[PDB]
Amino acid sequence: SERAYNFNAGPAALPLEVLERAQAEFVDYQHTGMSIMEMSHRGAVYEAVHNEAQARLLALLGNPTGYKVLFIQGGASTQFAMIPMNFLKEGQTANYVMTGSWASKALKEAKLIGDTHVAASSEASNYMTLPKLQEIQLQDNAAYLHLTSNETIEGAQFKAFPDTGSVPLIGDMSSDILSRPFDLNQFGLVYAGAQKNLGPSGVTVVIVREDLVAESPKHLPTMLRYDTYVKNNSLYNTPPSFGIYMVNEVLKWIEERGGLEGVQQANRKKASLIYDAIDQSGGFYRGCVDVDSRSDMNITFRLASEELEKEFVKASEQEGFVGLKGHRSVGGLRASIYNAVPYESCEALVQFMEHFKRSRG
Amino acid sequence: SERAYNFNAGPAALPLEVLERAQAEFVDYQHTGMSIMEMSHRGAVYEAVHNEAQARLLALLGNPTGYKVLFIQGGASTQFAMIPMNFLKEGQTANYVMTGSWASKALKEAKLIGDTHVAASSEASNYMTLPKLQEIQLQDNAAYLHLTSNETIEGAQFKAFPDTGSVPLIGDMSSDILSRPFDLNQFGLVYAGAQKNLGPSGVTVVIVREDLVAESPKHLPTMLRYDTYVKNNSLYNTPPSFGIYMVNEVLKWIEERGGLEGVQQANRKKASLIYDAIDQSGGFYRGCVDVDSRSDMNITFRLASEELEKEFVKASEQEGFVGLKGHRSVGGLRASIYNAVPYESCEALVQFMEHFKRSRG
Numbered sequence: 158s159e160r161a162y163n164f165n166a167g168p169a170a171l172p173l174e175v176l177e178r179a180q181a182e183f184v185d186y187q188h189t190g191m192s193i194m195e196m197s198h199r200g201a202v203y204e205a206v207h208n209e210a211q212a213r214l215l216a217l218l219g220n221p222t223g224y225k226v227l228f229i230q231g232g233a234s235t236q237f238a239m240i241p242m243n244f245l246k247e248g249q250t251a252n253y254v255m256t257g258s259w260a261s262k263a264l265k266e267a268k269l270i271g272d273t274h275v276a277a278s279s280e281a282s283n284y285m286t287l288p289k290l291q292e293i294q295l296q297d298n299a300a301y302l303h304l305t306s307n308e309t310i311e312g313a314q315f316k317a318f319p320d321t322g323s324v325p326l327i328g329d330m331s332s333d334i335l336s337r338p339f340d341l342n343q344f345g346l347v348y349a350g351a352q353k354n355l356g357p358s359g360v361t362v363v364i365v366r367e368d369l370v371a372e373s374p375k376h377l378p379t380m381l382r383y384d385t386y387v388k389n390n391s392l393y394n395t396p397p398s399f400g401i402y403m404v405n406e407v408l409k410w411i412e413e414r415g416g417l418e419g420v421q422q423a424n425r426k427k428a429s430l431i432y433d434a435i436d437q438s439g440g441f442y443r444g445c446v447d448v449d450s451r452s453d454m455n456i457t458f459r460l461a462s463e464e465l466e467k468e469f470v471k472a473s474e475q476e477g478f479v480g481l482k483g484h485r486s487v488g489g490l491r492a493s494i495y496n497a498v499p500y501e502s503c504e505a506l507v508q509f510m511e512h513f514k515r516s517r518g
Numbered sequence: 519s520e521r522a523y524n525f526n527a528g529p530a531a532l533p534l535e536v537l538e539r540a541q542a543e544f545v546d547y548q549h550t551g552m553s554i555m556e557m558s559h560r561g562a563v564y565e566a567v568h569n570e571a572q573a574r575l576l577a578l579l580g581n582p583t584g585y586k587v588l589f590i591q592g593g594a595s596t597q598f599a600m601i602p603m604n605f606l607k608e609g610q611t612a613n614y615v616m617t618g619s620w621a622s623k624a625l626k627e628a629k630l631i632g633d634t635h636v637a638a639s640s641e642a643s644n645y646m647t648l649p650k651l652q653e654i655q656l657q658d659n660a661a662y663l664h665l666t667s668n669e670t671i672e673g674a675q676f677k678a679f680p681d682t683g684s685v686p687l688i689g690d691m692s693s694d695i696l697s698r699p700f701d702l703n704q705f706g707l708v709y710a711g712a713q714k715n716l717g718p719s720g721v722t723v724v725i726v727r728e729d730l731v732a733e734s735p736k737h738l739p740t741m742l743r744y745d746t747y748v749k750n751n752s753l754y755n756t757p758p759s760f761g762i763y764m765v766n767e768v769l770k771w772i773e774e775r776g777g778l779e780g781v782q783q784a785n786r787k788k789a790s791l792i793y794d795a796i797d798q799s800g801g802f803y804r805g806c807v808d809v810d811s812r813s814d815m816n817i818t819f820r821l822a823s824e825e826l827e828k829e830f831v832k833a834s835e836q837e838g839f840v841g842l843k844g845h846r847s848v849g850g851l852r853a854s855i856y857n858a859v860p861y862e863s864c865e866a867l868v869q870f871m872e873h874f875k876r877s878r879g
C-alpha cells in the first residue's frame with residue numbers, strides 16, 4: 158500500500174485512481190458476469206469502449222475533424238516500419254529530423270524501405286541542441302517529414318512543430334502525447350506507444366489524416382496497411398482490448414485533470430522543480446541537453462562521474478525511487494515525469510537530490 | 519454465482535481464479551508499490567515474469583529442447599505475413615493445408631510474399647471433412663508446410679499432425695494451443711494469439727525451433743524478423759507486458775488443472791456432453807462437421823433454419839449465455855469451449871438446448 162516513487166521511462170506510472178477503478182471491475186465489468194478481457198471485440202460492450210476511447214482522444218485535442226484514431230499493435234517500433242512502408246514510394250525520399258536515439262531508430266527502418274533524407278540534425282551537438290525549425294529543409298521528392306516530438310533517452314523536446322505545406326508531417330509522440338495541447342492539423346500522422354505517457358502497454362495510438370490513407374499500397378501485408386485499420390475501425394483482427402479499455406480510463410482521467418491544458422500546467426510545475434534542483438546544485442548535477450531543448454517529460458542529468466551516478470541510483474532505490482538510472486546507451490540519470498507521475502514523487506526526488514548533494518559533494 | 523455462460527470464440531473466457539489473482543495484485547504487485555503495468559520491461563521484476571512464462575509453457579509441453587518461446591504483438595494475423603516473410607525465399611513455395619476459414623486467411627497473406635502451393639484441401643467437402651494426412655503432397659521446393667490445427671469457424675480439428683521430414687511444419691494453433699499434449703518436435707513453428715486459450719488479446723505466442731530462425735532475412739523490417747525476438751528475448755521493444763503477465767497466470771492455472779493431460783480430459787468431457795446433446799436431439803440439432811473432424815474447442819451445429827438459430831441465441835442470452843451464434847460466414851451455432859470454459863457452462867448449455875427444443879420442434 159505505499160506507492161513507489163516511480164520514475165520509470167516506459168512502461169511507466171499510471172494514475173492510482175485509474176488502477177483502482179480498473180481493479181474494482183477487473184473480474185466483473187458492469188454486472189455482465191465477464192471481465193472486459195473476456196468479451197467479444199465485435200460485441201456492443203467492448204465496441205462501445207473501443208469507440209469511446211477514440212472520441213475522447215479527439216475531444217481532448219479540440220475535436221479536429223478528418224482524423225481517425227487507430228489502435229495498432231507492435232509498439233511505436235512497428236510504426237517506424239509501417240510509416241515508410243505505407244508512404245515511401247520509389248522516386249521519393251523519407252525525410253527525417255535527427256534529434257537523438259528514437260529519431261535514429263525511425264530512420265533505420267525507413268532506410269530498409271527506400272531512399273531517405275536527413276532534413277535536419279542535432280548530431281553535431283551530441284543531440285543536446287535541437288534543430289531550430291528554420292534548419293529543417295525537405296528534399297523536393299519528400300514523401301513525408303518525420304520528427305520525434307520528445308527524445309525520451311536524451312531528454313530533449315520540441316516546443317513547436319514546422320509547417321511542411323503539402324508534405325505530410327509525421328510525429329513520434331510516444332513520450333509526450335497528450336502532455337500538452339497541440340494542433341493536430343499540422344500533422345498527417347501522429348503516433349505513440351501508449352505505455353509511456355498514457356501507461357497501458359501493447360497498444361500504439363496512431364492518429365491519421367484520413368485523406369492520407371484512403372488507399373494503402375496493395376503489396377503490403379494486410380496488417381501493415383493503414384487502410385486495414387481505417388476501414389475496419391481497428392477491428393480487422395482482435396485488438397488489444399484490455400489495453401484500449403485502459404487507454405479509455407486514462408483519457409477520462411486526463412479530462413478530469415483539466416484536459417491537456419491542465420496536465421501541461423501540472424507537468425511544467427513538476428519539471429520546473431527538478432530543473433531548479435539541477436540548476437541550483439553548485440555544479441553537482443548538470444543537465445544533458447541545452448536549456449532551450451529541455452523536455453518536460455524526461456529530465457536527464459549527470460553527476461561528476463559514473464561511479465557517483467551508480468551511487469546515486471543505488472541510494473535512491475533504498476529510498477523508494479524506481480527507474481532513475483539513465484538509459485544504458487547514454488548513462489547519467491533520467492527522471493521520467495509523464496502525466497501520471499505525481500508532484501509528490503518529484504518533491505521527494507528533489508529532497509533526495511539535495512541530501513545526496515550535501516553528503517557526496 | 520453470477521458468471522456469464524461465456525461461449526465467446528475469441529476473446530474468450532479466462533479462469534475465474536486467474537482473474538481474481540490478477541485483480542488482487544493489480545494495484546500493488548508484491549509490495550513493490552507499483553502495478554505490474556507500471557514497471558520497466560527491462561527491470562528484474564517484469565523480466566522474471568517474462569522469463570517464467572516461457573519456462574512454464576515449455577514445461578507444460580514436456581520441456582522440449584531447442585525451442586524458443588517468443589511473445590510477438592499483432593495477433594495470429596500478423597504471423598500470417600511474418601511466417602512467409604521470414605521463410606519463403608525466391609525459388610521456394612509456401613505449402614498450405616487448406617481446411618477452412620483460417621487456413622484461407624493464412625494462404626491469402628502468403629501469396630502477397632511469394633509462391634504458394636495447396637498441399638491438401640478439404641474444399642470439396644465445404645471444409646467439413648479434414649484432409650487425411652496421406653493426402654498431403656509437397657513439392658521439393660517447399661519452404662514449409664503450414665496447417666491450422668483447429669479451424670475455429672468451421673469446428674474442425676486435427677487429432678494428429680504429419681511428419682514432414684526436412685520441410686518445417688508450421689501450425690496455427692490459435693484456438694487449441696495448450697488444450698492437449700502434442701509433440702512440439704514435429705513442428706518448426708507453432709503460434710497462437712493468446713486470446714482463445716492462453717489469456718487476453720494483445721500477445722501472440724510463437725514457439726520456434728531455434729535452428730529455423732538463426733538468421734532472419736536481413737531485408738526485412740526489424741520488427742518482422744524472428745531473430746529480433748530471439749536475440750532480444752522478445753524485449754527488443756516494449757512487450758505486451760500485462761498480457762504476458764496474464765499468460766503466466768494462465769499457465770500456472772493449467773498446471774494446477776493437471777497440465778495438458780488434465781485440460782485435455784476436462785475438455786473432452788465438456789465436448790462429449792455437447793456432442794451428445796446435439797447427436798441425441800433426433801435431428802433438432804445437427805453437427806456440421808464429419809465425426810472424425812470434430813473439434814473439442816469449437817463445436818459447430820445447426821438448427822432447422824437460421825431464423826430459428828437467431829431465436830435460440832436470443833433466448834440463450836436471457837439465460838446468461840454469450841457467444842453462441844456461429845460466425846456470419848457459415849451461420850449456425852458455435853459453442854466455444856476453450857480450457858477456461860467450465861464444465862458448468864456446458865451443462866447449462868445442454869440443459870438450455872433441451873428446454874429450447876422442448877417448446878419447439
Ligand SMILES: *Cc1c(COP(=O)(O)O)cnc(C)c1O
Nearest residue numbers: 232233234259309331350755756
Ligand atoms: C519508447 C519509445 C519508442 C519505442 O516504443 P515501443 O512501443 O517500445 O516500440 C519509440 N519512440 C519513442 C519516442 C519512445 O520513447
Ligand SMILES: *Cc1c(COP(=O)(O)O)cnc(C)c1O
Nearest residue numbers: 394395593594595620670692711
Ligand atoms: C482468431 C484466429 C486467428 C486470428 O487471430 P488474431 O489475433 O485476431 O489475428 C487466426 N487463426 C485462428 C485459428 C484463429 O482462431
